């Protein structure tokens, strides 16, 4: 019964429309869902706009009139120019007439703001089509009718606001370059009269709703109008005084003044300088006398969240930071302006105490701008000494755990503030430290925040001052730990102590006995069962090692051996209570130290000693698991093997090229283990089905394979001796992984194989052309068949596949030349398949492979393979690129699509293609590819976009080919085409814009 | 005491997945594009009593836009969503906000950057500043890892109720209650369930 | 400096 | 909260799944603390589980002695068992539940406490 209005053969039952509309908005459940699908289908009727004049006049439901205006909107923005002329004037007076009638009824003007604004926006859509060439009197008649009624005058301000937004703020994406410029010039040519009406309304009062709507429109004007309208009138005086006093206009006025602080002004006229000082002084005066004084607790006000206080305090922070970042120099030399400057910054100090992350980041950016300036600019820092002193406390007390982006911003400002006055910084930190000891501010959060602050300023004090400060801080922190009783308290203070010492490597490097005591204490902490202590000891250990590795590899005075040997000797006792991943961090830390030893024989010996425990567990398992492979059924053995390999990964991660001797100790047996594990996975899938790949047993087995591939990848990506890579590593690796991958069922193939192969081709691809061919044969076709049925299945195989093809196309393009022609055709199909992905990883690589492939073909010169390539695939690449450019579903790759398209078109207009892109019969002989390219493109676009005129297609292509050596202009022409295909009747002259 | 919440943002940003997580606790891995809008009642339990959101989960893809800004009429709050792994979804945030505040001129709005669980983040935190001048609240969220997944509704609840101290509280737990003709039925469903692998077995939980 | 070590170990 | 009259026998972090048999698909129901609550004036033990942050109830049912914990094919740290009366989302409904833990240890410990509570509930 609800689906009657979808029948347009009858007359539209308006009362039945409101029933469907009301059931949608105020209804619920199944009836609302049904009315929803009906209204969507009604509005999407290409003839629904015909019945818009009836709904808009005889309906009593504003939501129905709103829906009618949406139907009109789609008609005006997409098919306006297709209508017969009488329909267009008939829509225009209908909209103009309704808006006048809605403004005259004060009840409707008060009660239907949504419908009126929807009508105004619909009017603006008409103006964008008809004004001013078919409506030169709009602005004059608007100014005329404004003085008649306050209501229509207020609404005229809404129309002008929306017009300014459509022309200047949102035109870039939505209209052609020519159409945008035409409207901007049209608004610019008549702004004098518009500003006159706006300034008169502002100065004469007195209706708040009219004043606010006028200020709302002024906010939009300031994005683009010349500065003379602001500085050569009295409007700054009205904004900074009159309109700041009343709260109704205060919010919008503050936003206007923020934009005024960004006007393009001349920097050499002293009168403009005085006007810029003056409106800031008035604005700060009005805030001090009408809103709150400089001493007010803004943190408490913001937290109370009364009315619009939060919006106001946000807007005040934006106004102050914006103005002072540009103009604070205007206040720093004149003695009479000193109080204004400091009161402004004192408001910012108070704003900076508000508990609001995003607001704090806004003020923190300004402080960064300030203290960086005081750090370099002469004679400036003394002005702000009291401001900066309060800032130090604000930042220390709001230090965050090292968003890490917010910590880095806080650290940067605090480092500057420490340089500007080292003495004040230390005093504040020690004072806060005492308030932690006397209990007045003691808290888990508060002691962590302070330690992070104390740790952030490392490297800014002198070494002597830093030495005394560190000692003082550790002393107080130590006494704070002894004072506390209970595990939990003693754990938090102990971690902060370890955090601080890890942040001061310069102190550790010069005090060995202290450094050694710290490390030994960390080792001791690795046996603590309390939650988080072990992670803390490991994280601190490797953090100290990264910064102080040299002091672990030398033989320190008072010592008999490098401390690295002492760590290695006791490594089983030290890590016996650690989780596996914590053990790997430890081994990685030792690998950092060992790489500092540049005596090869000593480094290899240290490497052998460090790997003693995993090597012996390895040698044992390889002996037992080979006789016979039933122990690998035991999940305990599978876990032990993975941990051994992961340990090798951890050490290889930090040692890189130095890891090679340890890799050679296990390499052959590891690849043998890889084969044995691969057989059991295959046997398990055969005996239990694909579900076996989800079982813990098989997931454990595949973990071994993945860690083996990660280990080989990690070394090869860092190896310095590529000859050994090619002649010792690569051959056994390919035999181990290629055939196993190809001959497993899809669900059992490890995407890590593709990743590992990508690294192999990256490092040594130029040295193994037969190996690259072997990689392609084993993974190309079978992986492509996994990923060419949808965009969903096998996401990792998908990403690694195109990373692998990309590097092969970069480093060993000869491998594709050897492909059988049917296989090379799949390669092209795979590339275009990557175009159509919304997945950013696949899409970027697909476009890059396409570009690099075209370049590879170009470098071959006039050669049968190059010519056959253009014969078979040039127009495939042109048309497939045009498809993703124009389908509105791949906008994220516009720039790369444009570059690839520009390169394709440039080949033809540079005569880089020697062969004919056409058949010998299809086009007369002697025809250039340039002439044939224009024909093919014209016919392609004519069938793909039949609503375009032949003149449009010809002008677009003429401009496009003409501009194929200018990427920015080329892209602009593509954007103009993307706009014109969304409508009917686009102006073909638009493409002459450049 | 129920409030209308419109949820807008580019297609694929996770609007529907975010609501689903709040409705049932599930994480929908598939992208089935919303057609027009789906309305869902969502209730939260606070120390100020229950608050009900009528969540209008609108469509982001243009070809499925439906009534477009018609869905926004009489909305009392909103969430604008984008994808921190897709720059274009943040570039379009000003467009969604423009269409939204032209209909709803004075409502609390949360801006959400979804999918922060993905390592290769493309929209860096320091680049996200659009909310500043528009007085929107911003949160990094992830419907997958539940990072800050409650913050948008907590903030909106505080704004709509007028109490900055409103907090989510635990709904009261009634005592739960205590047939051979359905034994073979439950044993059929249980055997299929054991042989269907649990998803995301590599997660920490 | 050397007075810290004893307390550091005794944590 | 209607929990004061109860005692906490066991508490573990876990993720809970409900089986959508019509879709051949597991679906998460909530992640948070799973608690064994012994009512003091009936000695009955129930499962009460709430989601983090929102604190919404995603599991509320008695550890019936009829129920049987069975492993899942793809996990050594989970249990699957049919539930016939769970009132987390209102009217007493029946579910095929799956609950996963952080380690095989916490999963085995859960099954231990789950059976001890089964013995308490048949007295
Ligand atoms: N990694 C990750 N993926 C997510 C997250 N949230 C959603 N997704 C994924 O994003 C995809 C899009 O889901 P959906 O919620 O439908 O997006 P949408 O914005 O509602 N689409 P539309 O606007 O067209 O209705 C799904 O495949 C979903 O799994 C998240 O937090 N993390
Ligand atoms: Mg959706």
| Domain range annotation of chain B | 1-205
**Orientation angle between helical segments A463-483 and A422-437, nearest 10 degrees:** 10
To 5 degrees, how large is the angle CA A936–CA A870–CA A924? 50
Which of A531, A688, A696, A698 would you mutate first to test chain D, the one with the most D CBs within 10 A?
A696
SS (H, E, C) A89-129: HHHHHHHHHHHHHHHHCHHHHHHCHHHHHHHHHHHHHHHHH
Residue A751 tokens, joined = 């995407």
Residue A418 tokens, joined = 């420490």
Backbone angles phi, psi at B49, to 5 degrees: 100, -175
Ligand 1 neighbourhood includes B58 CB (under 6 angstroms): no
Which of B22, B141, B147, B176 would you mutate first to test chain D, the one with the most D CBs within 10 A?
B176
Which residues of B does the annotation place in the binding site for GTP? 10-17, 28-34, 60, 114-117, 142-144
Q: How far is CA A598 from the centre of its chain?
A: 42
CB atoms within 10 A of CB A619: 13
Tell me the shortest Cα–Cα distance from A896 to chain B, in angstroms: 14
CA nearest to D61, candidates D32, D22, D91: D91
A695 touches chain D (CB under 8 A): yes
Segments of B130-190 assigned E as strands: 137-140
* Domain carrying residue A280: 1-994
What's the start-to-end Cα distance of chain D, in Å?
A: 27
Q: What letter would DSSP give residue B172?
A: P
**For this experimental structure, what is the resolution in angstroms?**
2.3
Classify domain B1-205 at the CATH class level.
Answer: alpha beta
Residues of B in contact with A892 (CB under 8 A): 86-88
**Buried/exposed code over A846-879 (b: 16+ C-beta within 10 A; e: otherwise):** bbbbbbebbebbbeeeeeeebbebbeebbbebbe
Ligand 1 neighbourhood includes B29 CB (under 6 angstroms): yes
Tell me the shortest Cα–Cα distance from A558 to chain B, in angstroms: 47
CA nearest to A358, candidates D120, B86, D41, B135: B135
| 3-state secondary structure at position D90 | coil
Count Cβ–Cβ pairs < 8 Å, chain B vs chain D: 126
Residues of B in contact with D19 (CB under 8 A): 189, 192-193, 196
Please name the chains neighbouring A, where neighbouring means 3+ C-beta pairs under 8 angstroms: B, C, D
Residue A536 tokens, joined = 């803390």
| 3-state secondary structure at position B57 | strand
Q: Are A314 and B135 in contact (CB under 8 A)?
A: yes
Ligand 1 neighbourhood includes B34 CB (under 6 angstroms): yes
**CA pair distance A495, A497, nearest whole angstrom:** 5
**CA pair distance A877, A933, nearest whole angstrom:** 13
Backbone angles phi, psi at B104, to 5 degrees: -110, 90
Q: How many domains does chain D have?
A: 1
CA nearest to C10, candidates A479, A448, A559, A540: A479
Is it true that the peptide bond before A380 is cis, omega within 30 degrees of 0? Answer: no
**Orientation angle between helical segments A821-835 and A769-787, nearest 10 degrees:** 60
**CA pair distance A716, A656, nearest whole angstrom:** 8
Q: In what order do the strands lie in the sheet with B109-114?
A: B37-46, B49-58, B2-9, B77-83, B109-114, B137-140
* Residue to substitute in B6, B7, B8, B13 for testing ligand 1 pocket (most ligand atoms within 8 angstroms of CB): B13
Spatial neighbors of D40 by CB under 8 A, at least 6 apart, are: D5, D6, D7
CA distances from B130 to A221, B94, B110, B112 (A): 19, 8, 12, 11
Spatial neighbors of A38 by CB under 8 A, at least 6 apart, are: A2, A3, A5, A6, A20
Q: Do B103 and A118 touch (CB under 8 A)?
A: yes
Task: Select from A67, A255, A891 the Cβ nearest to the Cβ of B70.
Answer: A67
* Domain carrying residue D106: 1-123
Is it true that the peptide bond before B126 is cis, omega within 30 degrees of 0? Answer: no
To 5 degrees, how large is the angle CA A899–CA A903–CA A907? 170
CA distances from D52 to A46, A853, D35 (A): 49, 51, 13
Residue D20 tokens, joined = 């959508």
Count Cβ–Cβ pairs < 8 Å, chain A vs chain C: 29
Spatial neighbors of A656 by CB under 8 A, at least 6 apart, are: A595, A715, A718, A719
Q: Are A258 and A319 in contact (CB under 8 A)?
A: yes
Ligand 1 neighbourhood includes B65 CB (under 6 angstroms): no
**CA pair distance A280, B87, nearest whole angstrom:** 37
Is it true that the peptide bond before D78 is cis, omega within 30 degrees of 0? Answer: no
CA distances from B124 to A159, A233, A318, B138, B147 (A): 36, 42, 21, 14, 17
Q: How many domains does chain A have?
A: 1
Residues of A in contact with B133 (CB under 8 A): 255, 258, 318
Length of chain D equals 123
Q: How far is CA A512 from the centre of its chain?
A: 44
| 3-state secondary structure at position D44 | coil
Q: Do A482 and C5 touch (CB under 8 A)?
A: no
What's the start-to-end Cα distance of chain C, in Å?
A: 16
Q: Are A58 and A82 in contact (CB under 8 A)?
A: no
Q: How far is CA B72 from the centre of its chain?
A: 17
Please name the chains neighbouring B, where neighbouring means 3+ C-beta pairs under 8 angstroms: A, D
A712 touches chain C (CB under 8 A): no
Quick one: chain B helix, strand, coil %, rounded to 5? Answer: 35, 20, 45
Residues of A in contact with D75 (CB under 8 A): 696
CA nearest to B125, candidates A415, A893, A361, A353: A361
CB atoms within 10 A of CB A496: 25
CA distances from B32 to A353, B12, B14, D23 (A): 45, 9, 11, 15
| Domain of residue D112, CATH code | 2.30.29.30
Q: Are A326 and A262 in contact (CB under 8 A)?
A: yes
Ligand 2 centroid to Cα of residue B33, in Å, is 5
Chains D and C touch (3+ CB pairs under 8 A): no
CA nearest to B201, candidates D72, D21, D114: D72
Q: Do B198 and D58 touch (CB under 8 A)?
A: no
Ligand 1 neighbourhood includes B61 CB (under 6 angstroms): yes
Query: Element (H or E) spanning B188, and its range?
Result: helix B183-194
To 5 degrees, how large is the angle CA A952–CA A953–CA A955? 65
Chains B and D touch (3+ CB pairs under 8 A): yes
Quick one: chain D helix, strand, coil %, rounded to 5? Answer: 15, 50, 35
**CA pair distance A465, A467, nearest whole angstrom:** 5
This entry's atomic model was obtained through: X-ray
Spatial neighbors of A391 by CB under 8 A, at least 6 apart, are: A349, A352, A367, A371, A413, A417
Q: Is A54 exposed, middle or buried (0-12, 13-18, 19+ CB in 10 A)?
A: middle
Alpha helix locations (H) across A131-227?
Answer: 138-146, 150-164, 177-189, 191-204, 208-221
CA nearest to A595, candidates A659, A528, A667: A659
Residues of A in contact with D76 (CB under 8 A): 635, 696
**CA pair distance C4, A652, nearest whole angstrom:** 37
**CA pair distance A201, A547, nearest whole angstrom:** 67
Ligand 1 centroid to Cα of residue B33, in Å, is 9
For strands B109-114 and B77-83, give the pairing: parallel
In this structure, the residue with its CA closest to atom 8 of ligand 1 is B14
CA nearest to A165, candidates B132, B98, B105: B98
| 3-state secondary structure at position D29 | strand
Q: Are A834 and A802 in contact (CB under 8 A)?
A: yes
**CA pair distance A482, A933, nearest whole angstrom:** 84
CB atoms within 10 A of CB D119: 11
Q: Are A816 and A775 in contact (CB under 8 A)?
A: no
Residue with tokens 């009718």, as numbered in its chain: A145
């Amino acid at each position: 019964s609800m689906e009657g209005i979808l029948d347009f053969s009858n007359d539209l039952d308006i009362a039945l429309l409101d029933q469907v509309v009301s059931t949608f908005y105020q209804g619920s459940g199944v009836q609302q869902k049904q009315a929803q699908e009906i209204l969507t289908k009604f509005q999407d009727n290409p003839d629904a706009w015909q019945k818009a004049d009836q709904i808009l006049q005889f309906s009593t439901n504003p939501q129905s009139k709103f829906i009618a205006l949406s139907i009109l909107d789609k008609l005006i923005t997409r098919k306006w120019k297709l209508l017969p002329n009488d329909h267009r004037i008939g829509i225009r007076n209908f909209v103009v007439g309704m808006i006048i009638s809605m403004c005259q009824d004060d009840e409707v003007f008060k009660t239907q703001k949504n419908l009126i604004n929807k009508s105004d926006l619909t009017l603006v859509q008409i103006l964008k089509q008809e004004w001013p060439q078919n409506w030169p009197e709009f602005i004059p008649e608007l100014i005329g009718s404004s003085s008649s009624s306050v209501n229509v005058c207020e609404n005229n301000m809404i129309v002008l606001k929306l017009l300014s937004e459509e022309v200047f703020d949102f035109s870039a994406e939505q209209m052609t370059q020519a159409k945008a410029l035409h409207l901007k010039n049209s608004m610019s040519k008549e702004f004098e009269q518009i500003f006159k009406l706006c300034f008169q309304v502002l100065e004469q009062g007195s209706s708040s709703s009219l004043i606010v709507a006028t200020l709302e429109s002024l906010l939009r004007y300031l994005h683009w109008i010349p500065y003379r309208y602001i500085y050569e009138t009295n409007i700054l005086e009205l904004l900074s005084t009159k309109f700041m006093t009343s709260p109704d206009t205060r919010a919008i006025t503050l936003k206007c003044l923020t934009e005024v602080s960004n006007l393009k002004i001349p920097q050499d006229n002293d009168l403009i300088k005085r006007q810029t000082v003056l409106f800031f002084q008035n604005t700060l005066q009005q805030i001090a006398t009408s809103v709150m004084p400089v001493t007010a607790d803004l943190k408490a006000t913001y937290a109370n969240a009364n009315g619009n206080d939060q919006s106001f305090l946000q807007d005040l922070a934006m106004f102050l930071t914006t103005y002072l970042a540009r103009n604070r120099a205007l206040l720093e030399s004149d003695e009479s302006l000193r109080e204004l400057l400091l009161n402004a910054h004192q408001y910012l100090i108070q704003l900076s105490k508000i508990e609001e992350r995003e607001l704090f980041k806004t003020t923190l950016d300004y402080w960064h701008n300030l203290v960086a300036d005081l750090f370099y600019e002469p004679l400036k820092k003394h002005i702000y000494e009291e401001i900066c002193s309060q800032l130090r406390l604000v930042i220390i007390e709001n230090m965050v755990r090292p968003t890490i982006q917010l910590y880095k911003s806080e650290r940067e400002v605090l480092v500057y503030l420490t340089h500007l006055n080292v003495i004040d910084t230390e005093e504040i930190m020690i004072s806060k430290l005492a308030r932690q000891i006397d209990g007045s501010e003691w808290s888990w959060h508060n002691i962590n925040t302070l330690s992070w602050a104390i740790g952030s300023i490392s490297g800014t004090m002198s070494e002597d001052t830093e030495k005394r400060f560190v000692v003082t801080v550790i002393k107080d922190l130590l006494g704070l730990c002894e004072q506390k009783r209970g595990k939990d308290n003693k754990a938090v203070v102990a971690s902060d102590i370890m955090y601080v010492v890890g942040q001061y490597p310069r102190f550790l490097k010069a005090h060995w006995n202290f450094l050694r005591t710290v490390i030994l204490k960390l080792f001791k902490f690795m046996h603590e069962t309390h939650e988080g202590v072990q992670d803390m000891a490991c994280d601190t250990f490797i953090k100290i090692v990264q910064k102080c590795k040299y002091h672990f590899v030398i033989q320190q005075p008072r010592e008999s051996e490098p401390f690295i040997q002492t760590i290695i000797r006791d490594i089983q006792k030290t890590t016996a209570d650690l989780q596996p991943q914590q053990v790997h961090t430890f081994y990685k830390a030792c690998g950092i130290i060992i790489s500092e030893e540049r005596s090869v024989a000593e480094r290899n010996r240290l490497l052998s000693d460090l790997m003693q425990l995993p090597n012996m567990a390895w040698d044992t398992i390889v002996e037992q698991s080979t006789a016979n492979p039933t122990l690998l059924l035991d999940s305990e053995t599978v876990k032990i093997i993975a941990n051994i390999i992961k340990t090798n990964v951890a050490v290889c991660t930090s040692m890189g090229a130095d890891f090679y001797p340890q890799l050679g100790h296990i390499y052959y047996n590891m690849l043998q283990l890889y084969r044995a594990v691969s057989s059991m996975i295959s046997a398990q899938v055969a005996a239990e089905g694909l579900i076996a790949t989800k079982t813990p047993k098989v997931r454990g087995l595949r973990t071994i394979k993945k860690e083996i591939l990660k280990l080989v990848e990690t070394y090869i990506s860092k190896a310095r001796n590529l000859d050994d890579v090619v002649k010792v590593l690569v051959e056994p690796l390919l035999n181990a992984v290629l055939e196993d991958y190809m001959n497993n069922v899809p669900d059992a193939r490890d995407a890590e194989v593709l990743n590992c192969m990508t690294t192999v081709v990256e490092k040594v691809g130029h040295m193994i052309p037969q190996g690259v061919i072997l990689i392609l044969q084993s993974v190309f076709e079978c992986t492509l068949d996994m990923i060419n049925k949808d965009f969903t299945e096998y996401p990792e195989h998908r990403v690694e596949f195109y990373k692998l093809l990309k590097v092969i196309n970069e480093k060993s393009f000869a491998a594709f030349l050897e492909l059988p022609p049917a296989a090379f055709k799949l390669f092209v199909d795979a590339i275009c398949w990557a175009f159509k992905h919304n997945n950013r990883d696949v899409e970027v690589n697909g476009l890059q492979i396409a570009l690099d492939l075209v370049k590879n073909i170009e470098r071959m010169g006039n050669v049968p393979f190059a010519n056959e390539f253009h014969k078979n695939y040039f127009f495939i690449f042109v048309s497939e690129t045009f498809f993703v450019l124009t389908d509105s579903d791949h906008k994220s790759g516009f720039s790369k699509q444009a570059l690839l398209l520009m390169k394709l078109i440039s080949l033809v207009y540079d005569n880089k293609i020697s062969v004919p892109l056409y058949q010998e019969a299809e086009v007369p002989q002697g025809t250039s590819n340039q002439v044939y390219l224009s024909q093919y493109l014209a016919n392609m676009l004519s069938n793909a976009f039949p609503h375009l005129t032949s003149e449009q297609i010809a002008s677009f292509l003429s401009a496009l080919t003409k501009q194929c050596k200018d990427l920015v202009v080329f892209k602009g022409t593509l954007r103009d085409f993307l706009v014109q295909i969304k409508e009917v009747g686009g102006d073909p002259t638009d493409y002459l814009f450049a | 005491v129920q409030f209308k919440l419109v949820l807008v943002g580019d297609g694929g940003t996770g609007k529907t997945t975010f609501v689903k997580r709040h409705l049932t606790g599930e994480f929908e891995k598939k992208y089935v594009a919303t057609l027009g809008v789906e309305v869902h009642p969502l209730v939260f339990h606070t120390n100020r009593g229950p608050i009900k959101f009528n969540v209008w989960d609108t469509a982001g893809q243009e070809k499925f836009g439906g009534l477009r800004d018609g869905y926004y009429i009489q909305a009392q709050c909103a969430i604008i969503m984008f994808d921190v792994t897709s720059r274009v979804t943040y570039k379009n945030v000003p467009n969604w906000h423009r269409d939204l505040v032209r209909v709803c001129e004075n409502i609390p709005i949360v801006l959400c950057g979804n999918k922060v669980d993905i390592k290769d983040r493309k929209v860096k935190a320091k680049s996200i500043v659009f909310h500043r001048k528009k007085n929107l609240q911003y949160y990094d969220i992830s419907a997958k890892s539940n990072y800050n997944f409650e913050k948008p509704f907590l903030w909106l609840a505080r704004k709509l109720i007028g109490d900055p101290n409103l907090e989510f509280v635990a709904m009261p737990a009634l005592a739960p209650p205590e047939d051979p003709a359905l034994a073979a039925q439950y044993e059929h469903d249980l055997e299929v369930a054991q042989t269907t692998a649990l998803p995301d077995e590599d997660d920490d939980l | 400096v050397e007075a810290l070590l004893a307390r550091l170990r005794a944590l | 909260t209607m929990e004061e009259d109860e005692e906490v026998l066991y508490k573990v972090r876990a993720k809970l799944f409900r089986f959508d048999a019509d879709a051949k698909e597991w679906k998460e129901r909530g992640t948070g603390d799973c608690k064994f609550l012994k009512n003091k004036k009936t000695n009955k033990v129930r499962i009460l589980m709430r989601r983090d942050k929102t604190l919404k109830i995603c599991a509320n049912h008695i550890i019936a002695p009829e129920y049987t914990l069975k492993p899942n094919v793809g996990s050594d740290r989970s249990w699957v068992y049919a539930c016939t009366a769970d009132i987390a989302e209102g009217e007493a409904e029946a579910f095929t539940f799956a609950i996963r833990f952080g380690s095989k240890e916490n999963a085995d410990k859960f099954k231990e406490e789950f059976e001890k509570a089964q013995e308490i509930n048949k007295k």
